[PDB]
Structure formats: C-alpha cells, structure tokens
C-alpha cells in the first residue's frame, strides 16, 4: 500500500478519531494512550514480519542499533539521524525530519505517540520493556527517548 | 512495505471494536473516518494521475479500479454487475484488500472489516462532485467467493445554493 496511505491514516487518526477536545488531562491521556498503543501492535507485527531473524541481536545496543537503521526504514525510508545513550537504559532516537510531522502544527506531539508506540512494541519483541516518549526538538525534528524497563 | 498500512489499518479496527463493543458503531466509525481520508486522498490522486473528469460513471469506475486501486493497493478490481441504468456497477477483489485474516470463532458478524475503503470511495468521488453508495455485498472474510463493492451513483452535487 502506498505510504500515501498510511500518512492519512495517521493523520486522520490523531486529528479524527483519536484527537481530545481538550476537555482535561484524563482525555488527553486517554487518546495518547489509544493512538500509542495501536503503534505498540504495528510495532509487534513489523517484527514478527520482517525479523525472525531475532536470534541475532544478542544484546541492548544491536537491538537499538536495529530500531535506528533497519525499523525505521521500514516504517520511514530512512534511519535515524543520531542514537545517543547513558549507557544506563535512556536512548535518544533523533529524526531530522519526522515524517509524520507534514500532514502551523500546534497538536504536533499528538503525531509521534504511534511511533512511540512502534518502538515500544518493536522493542517488546525484541524482549525489551521500555517506556517511550517523544518531542519535537526543533520543527520538523524529533527526538524520541527510549526508557529501558529493569 | 505496507504490510504496515495493513497491521495500522488492523490495529484501528481491533481498538474500535475495543472502544466501541457495537460492530455497528464500528461500521460507522470507520465510514465516517474512510471519508475524512478520501476528500484528501482525492487531492493526491489527481495531482499524481494526470486524470481529467469522467464524462460518465462508467468511465468513473474505469479510473476508480484501474488506476486508483492500483495506485494505492497495487491491485486492479474487475468491474462487473453494471445495472441496465449504468447507475451501479461491482467492483471484485479475490481478497479483502485491507485486511488478511479473521479471528475465530467470529464474534463480530456485524463488523464490515475494510469499511474504510467505503467511507475513502464516498468522500473521494463527493469532491469530483458524485454522490454515491459504497458498500460490500460479497466479502471473502464473511465466506463470499470473492469480495465485492457495489458502487452507486446518487446524483451530482448541485453548484451552490
Ligand atoms: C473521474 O473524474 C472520477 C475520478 C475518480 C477518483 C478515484 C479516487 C478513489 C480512490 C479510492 C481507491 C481505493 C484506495 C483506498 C484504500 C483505502
């Protein structure tokens, strides 16, 4: 399917369905949640579908290494642009560019919680637990931190 | 690829039918959400086919299997079923085309997998100013042979009011 589509899709989602009127916190943290975790099974489904081969990361930081090059080409085209780390469980995934950030955007945190979710869920079959977070650092980039779960 | 359309487009219906519990509601849902996606798509589509207006509805359903389908989900609907009138025709697909797989046992009869496409097809063809019906009457998810969309011509959207 064109990628076309899937930018409408997301788009629609977040601003469509899954948008909060803005009524409070609980709202707000309800639609992230339902837009996060919907990425959190695509993420899963990638995995299974395009990496059985998951034998052969054996260990944290090929496992980032693969979200940073090979994930996000196949849900973005290209890789991230920088993988920083504390060594101690937080990596920062930058992307210059974010894709899903083009469909101004005053909501623009409300179109990486997918992704968030993607990662968390890429992650969780590569046998990671992590939490996910994302912000624009600078417009139309986009760092996403990855949290590593004890 | 767009096994990631198709695990997103997934991933919506199993978190409607999650919100919801009333495939009805879902049904609509995704409609309503098909639309919204098909007013923009149509934009794209026109921009990247260099397609001019359809003088004709059957020249309509000639653009909407052969280059639109293809262009998007890279498969080409047969057109059959043509009502004497012109005014309806069927579009068959040997698969649902957005969705591969069903869980069993079925506890969503009522759910229409690949609404979505119904909703795009209404809201794309409403901006070339075509009122129209979209629905499956063949679905190969529900068992039918094949999957079939019945397009329904309504009427032209009037110039102003
Ligand atoms: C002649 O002027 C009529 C133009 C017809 C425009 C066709 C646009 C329809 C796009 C729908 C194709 C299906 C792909 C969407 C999958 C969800």
């Known amino acids: 399917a064109d990628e076309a589509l899937f930018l409408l899709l997301h788009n629609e989602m977040v601003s469509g369905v899954y948008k909060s009127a803005e009524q409070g916190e609980v709202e707000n943290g309800r639609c992230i949640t339902k837009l996060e975790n919907m990425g959190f099974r695509v993420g899963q489904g990638l995995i299974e579908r395009f990496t059985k081969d998951t034998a052969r990361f054996k260990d944290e930081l090929d496992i980032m290494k693969f979200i940073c090059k090979d994930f996000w080409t196949t849900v973005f085209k290209k890789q991230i642009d920088n ?55 600078s417009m139309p980039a986009c760092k996403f931190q990855v949290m590593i779960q004890k | 690829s767009s096994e990631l359309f198709t695990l997103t487009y997934g991933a919506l219906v199993t978190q409607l039918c999650k919100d919801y519990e009333n495939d009805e509601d879902v049904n609509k849902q995704l409609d309503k959400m098909g639309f919204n996606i098909g007013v923009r798509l149509i934009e794209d589509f026109l921009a990247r086919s260099n397609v001019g207006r359809c003088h004709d509805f059957r020249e309509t359903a000639d653009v909407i299997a052969k280059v639109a389908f293809k262009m998007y989900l890279g498969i080409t609907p047969s057109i059959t079923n043509w009502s004497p009138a012109g005014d309806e025709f069927s579009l068959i697909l040997e698969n649902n085309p957005l969705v591969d797989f069903v869980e069993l046992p079925d506890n969503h009869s009522s759910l229409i997998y690949s609404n979505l496409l119904c909703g795009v097809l209404r809201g794309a063809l409403e901006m070339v100013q075509m009122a129209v019906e979209a629905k499956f009457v063949q679905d190969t998810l529900k068992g039918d042979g094949v999957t079939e969309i019945r397009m329904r011509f309504i009427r032209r959207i009037e110039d102003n009011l």
């Open chain 1, 83 to 137: 993988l920083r780390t504390n060594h101690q469980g937080i990596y920062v995934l930058q992307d210059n560019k974010f894709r899903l950030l083009t469909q101004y955007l005053e909501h623009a945190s409300k179109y990486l919680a997918f992704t968030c979710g993607l990662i968390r869920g890429g992650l969780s079959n590569l046998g990671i637990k992590s939490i996910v977070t994302a912000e624009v650092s």
